[PDB]
Structure formats: structure tokens, C-alpha cells
Structure 1
Amino acid sequence: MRDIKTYLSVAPVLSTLWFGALAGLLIEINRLFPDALSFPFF
């Protein structure tokens, strides 16, 4: 079990999941704010 944990902590899979989460966040932001060119908050 702990072996599969140390394997999961190997940079490829960690990086893939991290990048997937980041891309999901970005595409969701783009969905909720289409075309988002300026900073119309301040």
C-alpha cells in the first residue's frame, strides 16, 4: 500500500493531476466569465 503511495508521489502522475485541476479551474472561470478581456472591478 505505502509502495503505491510513494509511486503516486512520483512527479509524472502528480504533475498530470495538478495540471488537470488547474486547467479545469481555468476553463470553469472562462465559462463563468466569457471573454473576460479587462478588469472591470476597480
Structure 2
Amino acid sequence: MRDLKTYLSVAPVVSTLWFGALAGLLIEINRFFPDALIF
């Protein structure tokens, strides 16, 4: 379990989760505040 957590903390997994979260965020923001060219 500790080993599995360590694996989940490895660079590619961390990157997939981080950029996944970011992608989700930017997507939702661009869904609620769409076509933003100013601000």
C-alpha cells in the first residue's frame, strides 16, 4: 500500500493527475465563462 502510494507519487502519474485536474478546471471555466478575449 505504501509502495502503491509511492508509485502514485511517481513523475508520470503525478503529471497525469495534475494535468488532468488542470484540464478539467480550464474546461469548466471555459464552459461557464466562454469566448473570453478580455480578462
Q: State the TM-score, normalized to the length of structure 1.
A: 0.83
Gaps of at least 5 residues in structure 1 are none
- CA RMSD in angstroms comes to 0.7
Percent identity over paired residues: 90
Partner of 1:5, secondary structure, is helix
Q: State the TM-score, normalized to the length of structure 2.
A: 0.88
Gaps of at least 5 residues in structure 2 are none
Count of residue correspondences: 39
* Higher gyration radius (CA): 1
Question: Which structure has greater helix proportion?
Answer: 2
